[PDB]
Design an enzyme around this catalytic site. Structure first.
Site, PDB file in Angstrom:
ATOM      1  N   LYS A   1       0.825  -1.224   0.000  1.00 39.67           N
ATOM      2  CA  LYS A   1       0.000   0.000   0.000  1.00 39.67           C
ATOM      3  C   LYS A   1       0.862   1.280   0.000  1.00 39.67           C
ATOM      4  O   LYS A   1       0.431   2.343  -0.459  1.00 39.67           O
ATOM      5  CB  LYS A   1      -0.953   0.000   1.208  1.00 39.67           C
ATOM      6  CG  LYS A   1      -2.434  -0.118   0.872  1.00 39.67           C
ATOM      7  CD  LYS A   1      -3.152  -1.165   1.743  1.00 39.67           C
ATOM      8  CE  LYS A   1      -4.137  -2.035   0.921  1.00 39.67           C
ATOM      9  NZ  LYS A   1      -5.587  -1.882   1.280  1.00 39.67           N
TER      10      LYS A   1
ATOM     11  N   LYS B   1      -4.675  -9.725  -5.799  1.00 42.42           N
ATOM     12  CA  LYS B   1      -5.907 -10.134  -5.149  1.00 42.42           C
ATOM     13  C   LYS B   1      -7.064  -9.228  -5.612  1.00 42.42           C
ATOM     14  O   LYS B   1      -6.844  -8.094  -6.075  1.00 42.42           O
ATOM     15  CB  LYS B   1      -5.725 -10.004  -3.632  1.00 42.42           C
ATOM     16  CG  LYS B   1      -6.987 -10.284  -2.812  1.00 42.42           C
ATOM     17  CD  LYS B   1      -6.882  -9.672  -1.416  1.00 42.42           C
ATOM     18  CE  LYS B   1      -6.566  -8.186  -1.454  1.00 42.42           C
ATOM     19  NZ  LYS B   1      -7.604  -7.379  -0.756  1.00 42.42           N
TER      20      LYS B   1
ATOM     21  N   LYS C   1     -11.371  -4.297  -3.457  1.00 45.34           N
ATOM     22  CA  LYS C   1     -12.520  -3.414  -3.692  1.00 45.34           C
ATOM     23  C   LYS C   1     -12.143  -1.920  -3.885  1.00 45.34           C
ATOM     24  O   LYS C   1     -13.007  -1.068  -4.211  1.00 45.34           O
ATOM     25  CB  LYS C   1     -13.521  -3.575  -2.541  1.00 45.34           C
ATOM     26  CG  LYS C   1     -13.233  -2.658  -1.336  1.00 45.34           C
ATOM     27  CD  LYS C   1     -14.453  -2.461  -0.426  1.00 45.34           C
ATOM     28  CE  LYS C   1     -14.355  -3.294   0.847  1.00 45.34           C
ATOM     29  NZ  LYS C   1     -13.112  -2.900   1.554  1.00 45.34           N
TER      30      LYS C   1
HETATM   31  N1  LIG Z   1      -9.692 -11.020  -2.859  1.00 47.32           N
HETATM   32  C1  LIG Z   1     -10.149 -11.476  -1.722  1.00 47.32           C
HETATM   33  N2  LIG Z   1     -10.588 -12.823  -1.645  1.00 47.32           N
HETATM   34  C2  LIG Z   1     -11.086 -13.453  -0.493  1.00 47.32           C
HETATM   35  N3  LIG Z   1     -11.197 -12.694   0.652  1.00 47.32           N
HETATM   36  C3  LIG Z   1     -10.788 -11.328   0.644  1.00 47.32           C
HETATM   37  C4  LIG Z   1     -10.252 -10.690  -0.496  1.00 47.32           C
HETATM   38  N4  LIG Z   1      -9.910  -9.364  -0.213  1.00 47.32           N
HETATM   39  C5  LIG Z   1     -10.260  -9.212   1.098  1.00 47.32           C
HETATM   40  N5  LIG Z   1     -10.797 -10.375   1.641  1.00 47.32           N
HETATM   41  C6  LIG Z   1     -11.295 -10.561   3.044  1.00 47.32           C
HETATM   42  O1  LIG Z   1     -12.327  -9.696   3.102  1.00 47.32           O
HETATM   43  C7  LIG Z   1     -12.473  -9.055   4.399  1.00 47.32           C
HETATM   44  C8  LIG Z   1     -12.764  -7.635   4.295  1.00 47.32           C
HETATM   45  O2  LIG Z   1     -11.532  -6.968   3.945  1.00 47.32           O
HETATM   46  P1  LIG Z   1     -11.320  -5.459   4.130  1.00 47.32           P
HETATM   47  O3  LIG Z   1     -11.740  -5.119   5.471  1.00 47.32           O
HETATM   48  O4  LIG Z   1     -11.965  -4.751   3.056  1.00 47.32           O
HETATM   49  O5  LIG Z   1      -9.792  -5.250   3.980  1.00 47.32           O
HETATM   50  P2  LIG Z   1      -8.896  -5.523   2.711  1.00 47.32           P
HETATM   51  O6  LIG Z   1      -7.918  -4.380   2.582  1.00 47.32           O
HETATM   52  O7  LIG Z   1      -8.069  -6.814   2.800  1.00 47.32           O
HETATM   53  O8  LIG Z   1     -10.110  -5.460   1.640  1.00 47.32           O
HETATM   54  P3  LIG Z   1     -10.237  -5.049   0.164  1.00 47.32           P
HETATM   55  O9  LIG Z   1      -8.916  -5.193  -0.433  1.00 47.32           O
HETATM   56  O10 LIG Z   1     -11.294  -5.784  -0.578  1.00 47.32           O
HETATM   57  O11 LIG Z   1     -10.514  -3.611   0.277  1.00 47.32           O
HETATM   58  P4  LIG Z   1      -9.540  -2.312   0.243  1.00 47.32           P
HETATM   59  O12 LIG Z   1      -8.375  -2.483   1.160  1.00 47.32           O
HETATM   60  O13 LIG Z   1      -9.049  -2.119  -1.173  1.00 47.32           O
HETATM   61  O14 LIG Z   1     -10.279  -1.101   0.653  1.00 47.32           O
HETATM   62  C9  LIG Z   1     -11.253  -9.519   5.229  1.00 47.32           C
HETATM   63  O15 LIG Z   1     -11.568 -10.474   6.235  1.00 47.32           O
HETATM   64  C10 LIG Z   1     -10.375  -9.980   4.080  1.00 47.32           C
HETATM   65  O16 LIG Z   1      -9.247 -10.738   4.279  1.00 47.32           O
END
Ligand SMILES: Nc1ncnc2c1ncn2[C@@H]1O[C@H](COP(=O)(O)OP(=O)(O)OP(=O)(O)OP(=O)(O)O)[C@@H](O)[C@H]1O
Ligand SMILES: Nc1ncnc2c1ncn2[C@@H]1O[C@H](COP(=O)(O)OP(=O)(O)OP(=O)(O)OP(=O)(O)O)[C@@H](O)[C@H]1O
Ligand SMILES: [Cs+]
Ligand SMILES: [Cs+]
EC number: 6.1.1.2
Lengths: 328, 328
Positions: A111, A192, A195
């Protein structure tokens, strides 16, 4: 029963990746465990967020949390910032964590690209996540694979504080699913599904419409062999699409490899689009119901009330152990 | 009137250095301004503190704050940790501050010696101090010289947030006294008098007894010329002792240079000891009164109550600007 905690950042609309890797299992777990589900908004701000959009993503995530079947009377669903104890705990843990420990976090080196100047809340993300968890005397943290490391640092910080100031915290354990823990980006199968991906084609959100799902699936990065078989190193694209298809449909990678033989990508994709479409159909309909009523707000009020009693009691204890404030 | 904010860490008993450079001016200012005086305990923990001793130093600092003449009905005196908003604000500001900005803080490179592993709360000290200040729409921050830089970072963070999320914060200004802003260690006149100095001979605390003051003064690092004259580069010791003598007695460096001519160190010191002794005599007597009564606790309760209303309203506003939580 045992206690579980999991948070989801309100940094975009949750993707089929957040759904398969975490949220989906929340719906079953809420019956087996004492569960706290959080809209982690204070985490969301470690990186820029337009204010109006953060506000709206917070309320949408809440609605989806419910829409996918979280029962407000079986699990406590709430917004982090509505519970001050998370920030109070976070600071006390920032005081026992080591910069070197933060600096080495994977999610922080990633990040924090060579990017000129980074916000400290990106270095300090982990102590806040440790608070989220430790505040509720958490046993299991049901998360996707990427959050594993953060959870280990959580464990070290719990043990550090326990031996420094006396037993107080429960040593949590991660609980990553054996399947679909790392759903990959539809646009780059080495990354990965995230979002907050600048490229919307990277993910499918729980709120995407049929047309849109059909395009992102169609656009998905496959290969040349027009061969629907599973290979993580050879066909990282097709592999990923296979998983989503499997986990979402019920069929194994095999019954799908079979079903698609002398059959090509074009059809395999149009079907995947309908699998993802149908999966999200009930979710989205319940989602709309929750967005047009004051009922969602009541849920969240009672969720914060409940989180505040449990967590505020833990901060009192932590303060008592460290010697902060006065005898209460 | 205009608002002032100042904090004093409960990391040891305050020294004649903390007294001359800040606390002393609090007693006058509380009449000219709307003042908030804080026992910054969450800062104290950025570095190890024995729990029992932190608890007791917190209550002693409160008693001294009063003992030196702070009037609970003219100023609001309170303990930081008893006001959650300081941690809530601190996190929101940690998100707009830059690691590079923290890394460059003087107090952080100093306090972080080559020391093997440092607690992140030592890097993140500044955003918390920015919260302390900005929460109360602070105009002036009456501090000794060492805190100047932290205050500038406070100003940059206020302006950063104002242009990022709209006008909300008042841009504070430091207010360092022209005299006695940097009282030096009695044991090394290149280092400031710091109440957390491993070497107790470095400082004289507001609670030191006559015998003890007489020794630390006697032990004070002077020079060889046995000449009582002021020179910061030549006789850094004697210079420092001159200031303390001046500021504390009322006489100028000159009327003192004069008074001590063909007169030597031995007598100049025994007199300084009595000046410091007499200065602290009334303070210490009032201090004992405040330590043996529940009255101190009532003061602090009403002080937190008042700080909580002002600061909690500011967090609501900051949240509203950043888009955290929900519409309240
Ligand atoms: N690609 C993925 N596949 C399976 N599980 C995933 C995947 N990406 C995140 N998680 C799981 O989703 C939960 C919520 O995650 P989060 O709180 O949004 O944090 P993150 O930083 O890992 O999520 P994102 O990547 O989707 O969002 P952003 O950071 O871009 O905002 C967690 O339990 C996570 O592991
Ligand atoms: N030597 C000094 N001379 C004049 N003023 C001083 C001197 N040292 C600190 N101050 C001023 O005192 C206030 C209280 O400071 P603090 O809150 O304790 O923070 P500090 O870190 O600068 O204080 P100390 O050095 O004495 O304590 P420790 O850190 O060792 O715990 C401030 O307004 C300050 O500038
Ligand atoms: Cs349950
Ligand atoms: Cs006043």
């Amino acid at each position: 029963m045992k206690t579980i905690f999991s948070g989801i950042q309100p940094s975009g609309v949750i993707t089929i990746g957040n759904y398969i890797g975490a949220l989906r299992q929340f719906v079953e777990l809420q019956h087996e465990y004492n569960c706290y589900f959080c809209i982690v908004d204070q985490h969301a701000i470690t990186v820029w967020q337009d204010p109006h959009e953060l506000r709206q993503n917070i309320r949408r995530l809440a609605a989806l949390y419910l829409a996918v079947g979280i029962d407000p009377t079986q699990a406590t669903l709430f917004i982090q910032s509505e519970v001050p104890a998370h920030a109070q705990a976070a600071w006390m843990l920032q005081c026992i964590v080591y910069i070197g420990e933060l600096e080495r976090m994977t999610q922080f080196k990633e990040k924090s690209a060579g990017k000129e100047a980074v916000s400290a809340g990106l270095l300090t993300y982990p102590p806040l996540m440790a608070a989220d968890i430790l505040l509720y005397n958490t046993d299991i943290v049901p998360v996707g694979e990427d959050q594993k490391q953060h959870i280990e640092l959580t464990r070290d910080l719990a043990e550090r504080f326990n031996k420094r100031y006396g037993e107080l915290f429960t040593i949590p354990e991660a609980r990553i699913p054996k399947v679909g823990a790392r759903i990959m980006s539809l646009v780059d199968p080495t990354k990965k599904m995230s979002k907050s991906d600048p490229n919307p084609k990277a993910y499918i959100t729980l709120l995407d419409d049929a047309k849109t799902i059909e395009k992102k699936i169609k656009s998905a990065v496959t290969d040349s062999e027009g061969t629907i078989r599973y290979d993580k190193e050879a066909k990282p694209g097709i592999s990923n699409l296979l998983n989503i298809y499997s986990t979402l449909s019920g069929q194994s990678i095999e019954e799908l490899e079979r079903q698609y033989e002398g059959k090509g990508y074009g059809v395999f994709k149009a079907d995947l689009a309908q699998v993802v479409i149908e999966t999200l159909r009930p979710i989205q309909e319940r989602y709309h119901h929750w967005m047009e009523s004051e009922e969602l707000d009541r849920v969240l009020d009672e969720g914060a009330e409940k989180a505040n009693r449990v967590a505020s009691e833990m901060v009192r204890k932590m303060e008592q152990a460290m010697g902060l404030g006065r005898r209460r």
